Amino acid sequence: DAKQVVVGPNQEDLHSAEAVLNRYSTVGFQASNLARAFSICEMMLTPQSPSPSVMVQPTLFVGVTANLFGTGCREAIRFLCTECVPLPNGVEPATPLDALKPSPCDSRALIHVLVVSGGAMEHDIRRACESYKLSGTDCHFGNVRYNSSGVASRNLFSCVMRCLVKRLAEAQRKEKANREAAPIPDVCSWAITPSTLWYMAGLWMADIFTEALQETGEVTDEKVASEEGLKRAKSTVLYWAARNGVPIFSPSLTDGDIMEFILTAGDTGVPLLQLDLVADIHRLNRLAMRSRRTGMMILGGGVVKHHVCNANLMRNGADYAVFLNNAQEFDGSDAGARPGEAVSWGKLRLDSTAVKVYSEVTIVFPLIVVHVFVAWVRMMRSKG
Amino acid sequence: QVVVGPNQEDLHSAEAVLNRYSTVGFQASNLARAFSICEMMLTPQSPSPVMVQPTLFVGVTANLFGTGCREAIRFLCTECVPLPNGVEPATPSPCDSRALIHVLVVSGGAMEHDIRRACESYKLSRTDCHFGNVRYNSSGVASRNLFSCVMRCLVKRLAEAQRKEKANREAYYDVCSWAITPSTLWYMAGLWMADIFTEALQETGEVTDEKVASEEGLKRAKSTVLYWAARNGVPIFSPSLTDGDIMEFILTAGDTGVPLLQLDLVADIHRLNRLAMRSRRTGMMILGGGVVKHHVCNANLMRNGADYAVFLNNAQEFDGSDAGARPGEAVSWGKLRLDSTAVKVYSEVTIVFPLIVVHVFVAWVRMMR
Amino acid sequence: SRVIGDLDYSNLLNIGQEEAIRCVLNAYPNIGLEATNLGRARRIVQRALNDNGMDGNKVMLAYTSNLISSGLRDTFACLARENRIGAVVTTAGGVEEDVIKCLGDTLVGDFALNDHALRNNGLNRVGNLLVPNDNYRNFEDFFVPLLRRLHEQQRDSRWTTKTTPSQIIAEIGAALESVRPNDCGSSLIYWCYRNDIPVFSPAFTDGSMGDMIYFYNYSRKGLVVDPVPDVRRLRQLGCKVGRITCIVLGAGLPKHHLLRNVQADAVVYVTTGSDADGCESSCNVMADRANGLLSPNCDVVRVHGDATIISPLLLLRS
Amino acid sequence: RVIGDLDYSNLLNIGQEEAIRCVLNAYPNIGLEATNLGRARRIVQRALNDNGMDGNKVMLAYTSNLISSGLRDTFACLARENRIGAVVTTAGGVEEDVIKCLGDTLVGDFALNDHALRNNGLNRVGNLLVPNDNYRNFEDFFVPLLRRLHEQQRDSRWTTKTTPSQIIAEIGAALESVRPNDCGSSLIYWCYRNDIPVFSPAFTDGSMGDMIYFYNYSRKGLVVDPVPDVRRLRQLGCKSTNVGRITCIVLGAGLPKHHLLRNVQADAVVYVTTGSDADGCESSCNVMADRANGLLSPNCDVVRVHGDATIISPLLLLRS
Ligand SMILES: NC(=O)c1ccc[n+]([C@@H]2O[C@H](COP(=O)([O-])OP(=O)(O)OC[C@H]3O[C@@H](n4cnc5c(N)ncnc54)[C@H](O)[C@@H]3O)[C@@H](O)[C@H]2O)c1
Ligand SMILES: NC(=O)c1ccc[n+]([C@@H]2O[C@H](COP(=O)([O-])OP(=O)(O)OC[C@H]3O[C@@H](n4cnc5c(N)ncnc54)[C@H](O)[C@@H]3O)[C@@H](O)[C@H]2O)c1
Numbered sequence A: 001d002a003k004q005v006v007v008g009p010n011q012e013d014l015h016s017a018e019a020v021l022n023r024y025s026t027v028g029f030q031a032s033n034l035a036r037a038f039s040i041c042e043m044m045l046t047p048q049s050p051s052p053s054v055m056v057q058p059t060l061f062v063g064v065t066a067n068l069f070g071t072g073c074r075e076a077i078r079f080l081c082t083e084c085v086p087l088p089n090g091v092e093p094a095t096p097l098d099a100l101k102p103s104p105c106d107s108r109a110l111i112h113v114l115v116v117s118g119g120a121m122e123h124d125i126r127r128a129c130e131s132y133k134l135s136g137t138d139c140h141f142g143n144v145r146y147n148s149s150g151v152a153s154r155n156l157f158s159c160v161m162r163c164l165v166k167r168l169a170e171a172q173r174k175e176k177a178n179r180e181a182a183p184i185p186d187v188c189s190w191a192i193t194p195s196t197l198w199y200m201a202g203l204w205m206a207d208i209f210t211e212a213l214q215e216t217g218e219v220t221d222e223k224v225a226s227e228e229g230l231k232r233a234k235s236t237v238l239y240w241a242a243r244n245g246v247p248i249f250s251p252s253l254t255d256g257d258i259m260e261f262i263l264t265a266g267d268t269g270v271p272l273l274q275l276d277l278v279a280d281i282h283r284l285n286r287l288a289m290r291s292r293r294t295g296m297m298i299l300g301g302g303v304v305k306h307h308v309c310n311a312n313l314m315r316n317g318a319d320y321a322v323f324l325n326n327a328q329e330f331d332g333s334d335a336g337a338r339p340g341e342a343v344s345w346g347k348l349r350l351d352s353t354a355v356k357v358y359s360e361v362t363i364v365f366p367l368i369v370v371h372v373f374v375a376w377v378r379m380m381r382s383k384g
Numbered sequence B: 001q002v003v004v005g006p007n008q009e010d011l012h013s014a015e016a017v018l019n020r021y022s023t024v025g026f027q028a029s030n031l032a033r034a035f036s037i038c039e040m041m042l043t044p045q046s047p048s049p050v051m052v053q054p055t056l057f058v059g060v061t062a063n064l065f066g067t068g069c070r071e072a073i074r075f076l077c078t079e080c081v082p083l084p085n086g087v088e089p090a091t092p093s094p095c096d097s098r099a100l101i102h103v104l105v106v107s108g109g110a111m112e113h114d115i116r117r118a119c120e121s122y123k124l125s126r127t128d129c130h131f132g133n134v135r136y137n138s139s140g141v142a143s144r145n146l147f148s149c150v151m152r153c154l155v156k157r158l159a160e161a162q163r164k165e166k167a168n169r170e171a172y173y174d175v176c177s178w179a180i181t182p183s184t185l186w187y188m189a190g191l192w193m194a195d196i197f198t199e200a201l202q203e204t205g206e207v208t209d210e211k212v213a214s215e216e217g218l219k220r221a222k223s224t225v226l227y228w229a230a231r232n233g234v235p236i237f238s239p240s241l242t243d244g245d246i247m248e249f250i251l252t253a254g255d256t257g258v259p260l261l262q263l264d265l266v267a268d269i270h271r272l273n274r275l276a277m278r279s280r281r282t283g284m285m286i287l288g289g290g291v292v293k294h295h296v297c298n299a300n301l302m303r304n305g306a307d308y309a310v311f312l313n314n315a316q317e318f319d320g321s322d323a324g325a326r327p328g329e330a331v332s333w334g335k336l337r338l339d340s341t342a343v344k345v346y347s348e349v350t351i352v353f354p355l356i357v358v359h360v361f362v363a364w365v366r367m368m369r
Numbered sequence C: 001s002r003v004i005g006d007l008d009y010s011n012l013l014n015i016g017q018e019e020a021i022r023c024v025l026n027a028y029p030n031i032g033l034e035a036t037n038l039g040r041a042r043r044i045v046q047r048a049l050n051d052n053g054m055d056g057n058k059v060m061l062a063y064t065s066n067l068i069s070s071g072l073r074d075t076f077a078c079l080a081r082e083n084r085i086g087a088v089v090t091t092a093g094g095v096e097e098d099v100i101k102c103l104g105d106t107l108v109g110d111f112a113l114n115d116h117a118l119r120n121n122g123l124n125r126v127g128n129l130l131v132p133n134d135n136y137r138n139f140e141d142f143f144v145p146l147l148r149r150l151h152e153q154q155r156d157s158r159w160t161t162k163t164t165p166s167q168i169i170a171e172i173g174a175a176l177e178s179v180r181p182n183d184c185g186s187s188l189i190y191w192c193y194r195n196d197i198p199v200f201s202p203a204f205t206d207g208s209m210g211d212m213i214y215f216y217n218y219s220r221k222g223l224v225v226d227p228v229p230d231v232r233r234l235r236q237l238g239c240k241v242g243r244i245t246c247i248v249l250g251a252g253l254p255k256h257h258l259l260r261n262v263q264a265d266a267v268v269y270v271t272t273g274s275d276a277d278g279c280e281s282s283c284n285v286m287a288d289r290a291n292g293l294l295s296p297n298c299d300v301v302r303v304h305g306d307a308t309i310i311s312p313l314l315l316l317r318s
Numbered sequence D: 001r002v003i004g005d006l007d008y009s010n011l012l013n014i015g016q017e018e019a020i021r022c023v024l025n026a027y028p029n030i031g032l033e034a035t036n037l038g039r040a041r042r043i044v045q046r047a048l049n050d051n052g053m054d055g056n057k058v059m060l061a062y063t064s065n066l067i068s069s070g071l072r073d074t075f076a077c078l079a080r081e082n083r084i085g086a087v088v089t090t091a092g093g094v095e096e097d098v099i100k101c102l103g104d105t106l107v108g109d110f111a112l113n114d115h116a117l118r119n120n121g122l123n124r125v126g127n128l129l130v131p132n133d134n135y136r137n138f139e140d141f142f143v144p145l146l147r148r149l150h151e152q153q154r155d156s157r158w159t160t161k162t163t164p165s166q167i168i169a170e171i172g173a174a175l176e177s178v179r180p181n182d183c184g185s186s187l188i189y190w191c192y193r194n195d196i197p198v199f200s201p202a203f204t205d206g207s208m209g210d211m212i213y214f215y216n217y218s219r220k221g222l223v224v225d226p227v228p229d230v231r232r233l234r235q236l237g238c239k240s241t242n243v244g245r246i247t248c249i250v251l252g253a254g255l256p257k258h259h260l261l262r263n264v265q266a267d268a269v270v271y272v273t274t275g276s277d278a279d280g281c282e283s284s285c286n287v288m289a290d291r292a293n294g295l296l297s298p299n300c301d302v303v304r305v306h307g308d309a310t311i312i313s314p315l316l317l318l319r320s
């Protein structure tokens, strides 16, 4: 029975944000939960021993709900996928390493795998084609507004995410034709899975922007439509997700703005795209099962919160977890569930350490990344 | 037990549905436990570790008197069942409560809503004031409206009665007797509710006949919780009275020369904490949170805890408040006993409170009658 | 109407107890606040479940996964058994634990139960409910063979007939009738198969079914779950004499998938999320109208509270 | 009025202190409830600087549980520097501020067994702990002051020190006399020295009411009158002067919020609440519903940030 005293921001530490956030531990209530969230995240980035059943860099399962790509969290998630600090001396990747090119699972960045809900990566793409305004009919997802034009409109966004659908449809047709001419073995190889769809999307974002910028007529010169397209395509997390190789899983992709373009592209006569969900969970649940220490940081709740902890369920529990939603427990949902409800199933392990910060994401997640994540790559880079 | 919900057969009667809430998960089981704990508050039994009937402390949020809960709380103050021959009750504002509930702790602005609903009608959505999808009209402080006249007669009656006792008395027998305490204020308001309405109905001009105004005044007065609370004798405590609509009249009634009224809070905390200290078996039903919840729990703290508790609110635990606190947080202070049974129903009051009154309280007074 | 009423509760002492509870539930539209929303929702749900039968209109149900872990699963089964529902939209757990509770029982517990002891005793917690691991061991005996059949059926057809969750869930209920002919009568999926009610689950692999697929694929690769034709399907069922009522108990993937692809004339919300989250589950009436989920002329009422208390009061028959 | 795009990688070369500020400065353009925090920060910071003593006033309304947390030390800095003009809080907001000079509040956990906490003499406040010995010492400090106040009210015709304002002001004076060392860390003490009126109309709802109940069981006399505090709080919230920029900082919405904004005419208001509009209460801060009831003027600048004030208030009060 050791107990700390309750002390909040002093006279001498209201002049530096570093000491305010440091003293969040001894303030109370839910700022202490955020103080743990700072620490558990720092553990997730620390090279540790294998799972308590040879040091490893834990594999980080990050989970993001869709609407958060509309707000500034898209900027912070992009940082997690952009910066690549190399592994030190005597540390292996926690997961020992194993047309429609599938998703590579070798993540050279801070996070290692990214699960999102349907309509998430759509918000990312439409935030380089437009600019979100705060409080062609305008849509609302809370404090923020954006413009949602027609599916076959001349909006820059509508052009980008039809050339994307057309590129996917023609690539799926090529793979189907090649396996039609070959003898039957046996997997359905022409079916694209959400991980590949977002991976090949991030690969194509550059050329698709350069093409859509011309088809909409915003810029008439190719050499500076090619340059502006790459500059717009370097703002999306899809680009850095494909470049550094963090797979974007999404079992709820079927419920996104993409489907507005998938269906309308099928109303011309050609069949719809063929998705496969068994390939995503196989890659996801094997990325988790094969690992030796796993971190978990989910933003919000829903399909995304349950999918990453289910992936770690194949592993008899995850080692670290930080849950950042404003859901409540009385409804007994997999969004408002406590971290304890996870360890009863075995999604979170018994020899663990986790915390739930009962507050909205936009307040806490920008503080999380700027206090440890940017600071932890500044440590690994400046010192040397 | 097994999880089973409303079946094919038992979707045709609301009794079986509300009975099967026990085997349905989540907050229906908490509401079914709230059903049982309320019946335990109504069952005559032995005192805490010579049978007694528990004294029930019910605390109500202010705005909840704007909604239909005013109707149900009025029922809790109206109907009364004689205690069986072999059970004893656990023993200016009187404490002799012959009714279902025995103490009423309400927030500031509650009884002002109780008064205002017999003067006009509260409208719903799909200058006028808002509290959710309900809308009411609070007219000017010195207006000709019926509510303003009733509240002015009340304040004027209280000021004149305070001066008389002041002039009357102008160590252990040296108390500030001219100070009026919230429990006495709402008590006297319930006594005067008949005559105050009859006088205001004339001063407004809606009915100039003395006979019809006398009959209509009693009809509007009988609808308020204040009337039956004073008639059957449940004290209406409110330390937050200083923050209600009534202060708009008490303050400007002092802007015409006469001093403001003189409140007293020590008399209220003494009567409240003594009704709980000298109690032998106590129940607790809190609608909402805030001042009303802590005041009832703190009253039972003087009795090293309460026996039964039912919290109907929609507050959360992460903010570390005394409104969103778990029932457990009560026993740590000693406000709730260890040998206790309690439950919190996480839901809006207006959904769960009518069910509770109709399912156990209405049924219990019919079983005993 | 449009005014708060006054109910003489003492007048209920003489009337029957059953009629007394109904007399108060009937005065809910004018009691106040989020009970008025319950009363308005009940009138929409009741008149929909009665009219929307076989006269040209439709009722579509959207429920979350935890609501069938509770007892509401049996209440929903009554709705599909009577062919009152036109279409069902659950996440993924609304199909699993509905079939599970034919192979075992869910138990009531408490939120306070120690989760470390529950793990060591093989007890999975769903809020204040418990699902023993033996239930999922039996589901592995039931579902793994069904995937073995579907894998052959897809391969013989080259992935053209049984690719979508709609056909899979429909044959899940058919397999439940064949394997377990006694307990199938209490399953929602069974009646959705027999009475021909399509069930939609675009995030199908998020749950125990995905884990069963994960075990099966790890030995025999080839199965495919294609959920994009279910969108063309669900839209074709919502494209409008033509009165389309949508009952959304709990929000999430149930709510969006239904109201985005179906144009409803009447919608009922029973949610708990708050607008501050800035998400879909925070059922904002005007904001959902701004995004095309609701038409501006659509009759809609939103109840804030746990659907476990609301749904029985809305579905209670007249 | 537009969501920004911040290059987080650009923070790697700038200093760490400025980096954390580069994001907190960008909070108005992040989105959702960080924008409302950034807007609230701009209002609070400008009010805490400009409205020191130039015909302007800043009034703070906090709930009782937030001085159980560490925010009481932060609040003390505000009244210590005479930046606050008036304080509104429920009884506990006064109690535990004086308590934490007579003892320490500890950090615990929401999961702690409350039955064991009782058997171990520990009072739980969310995830905080207040030992019973703290209140045993508070009884030694407060029940003499009650006897002093009774003699003071009795021989003065019950009309010299009857309101909570004068009582709380003399609580800071008594805390200066009895405990001269620890009094510097209490909000009530600086409110006495800097002459900042503290208002608590629900005074007997808390430990102070228990101390009064124990004292009034033998010496029946001591009384309290909170209705003159309404005239007092209205007197301080009167901008007929037309050169008043009067800001109200409401951290946590309970009785403080209503009692302050109802009697004080604020030109700028900041809400830091958690309740939801579905409750239909005077805590679920509804901006337009408060305007309809006269709590917010139609020309008043107001922002509402949704979250635990334990996380919000430090970022709002963080001096730049
Ligand atoms: N582009 C679109 O049209 C769009 C947008 C959003 C969601 N959806 C669909 O709705 C389905 C479920 O919606 P969802 O996954 O986005 O969330 P959700 O509606 O299912 O709610 C998830 C829970 O996480 C919490 N939460 C959500 N957002 C939060 C936030 N910003 N801050 C703090 N807590 C938060 C809340 O407690 C919430 O109840 C998805 O499968 C998706 O397909 C579509
Ligand atoms: N809960 C399970 O047992 C279970 C089982 C298998 C799979 N899953 C998976 O977990 C994911 C999330 O499940 P979900 O569909 O429940 O979404 P969810 O749990 O994230 O829904 C959260 C939101 O829905 C509303 N809500 C939740 N519970 C409610 C209630 N009892 N009454 C009223 N409203 C309520 C609230 O607005 C809440 O904010 C799904 O993708 C699903 O595939 C869950």
Ligand SMILES: NC(=O)c1ccc[n+]([C@@H]2O[C@H](COP(=O)([O-])OP(=O)(O)OC[C@H]3O[C@@H](n4cnc5c(N)ncnc54)[C@H](O)[C@@H]3O)[C@@H](O)[C@H]2O)c1
Pocket (backbone or CB within 6 Å): B061, B062, B063, B064, B107, B108, B109, B110, B112, B113, B240, B243, B244, B245, B287, B288, B289, B290, B291, B292, B312, B313, B314, B315, B316, B323, B324, B347, B348, B349, B350, D253, D254, D255, D258, D259, D275, D279, D280, D281, D282, D283, D284
């Ligand atoms: N007529 C008036 O002038 C008037 C009216 C209402 C309140 N007030 C003032 O506002 C102050 C605070 O109001 P309060 O005492 O009611 O507490 P509150 O409004 O600050 O909130 C109390 C808590 O109880 C819960 N709650 C409140 N109303 C609920 C409901 N209808 N259903 C379910 N849960 C509910 C909420 O979770 C809330 O957190 C009061 O002390 C009073 O002075 C004045």
Ligand SMILES: NC(=O)c1ccc[n+]([C@@H]2O[C@H](COP(=O)([O-])OP(=O)(O)OC[C@H]3O[C@@H](n4cnc5c(N)ncnc54)[C@H](O)[C@@H]3O)[C@@H](O)[C@H]2O)c1
Pocket (backbone or CB within 6 Å): A029, B289, B290, B291, B294, B315, B318, B319, B320, B321, B322, B323, B324, D062, D063, D064, D065, D066, D068, D089, D090, D091, D092, D093, D095, D125, D202, D205, D206, D207, D251, D252, D253, D254, D255, D256, D272, D273, D274, D275, D283, D284, D307, D308, D309, D310
């Ligand atoms: N548990 C305690 O902290 C404590 C201690 C001593 C006395 N009391 C007494 O309990 C009574 C009620 O307490 P209160 O009026 O001071 O507040 P409260 O406990 O009544 O809180 C009610 C409302 O204040 C808001 N709120 C509460 N905590 C919050 C937080 N951490 N962040 C943001 N918003 C928050 C919420 O909207 C909530 O609905 C008071 O009269 C007080 O005397 C409480």
Ligand code: NA
Pocket (backbone or CB within 6 Å): A067, A139, A140, A141, C291
């Ligand atoms: Na949206």
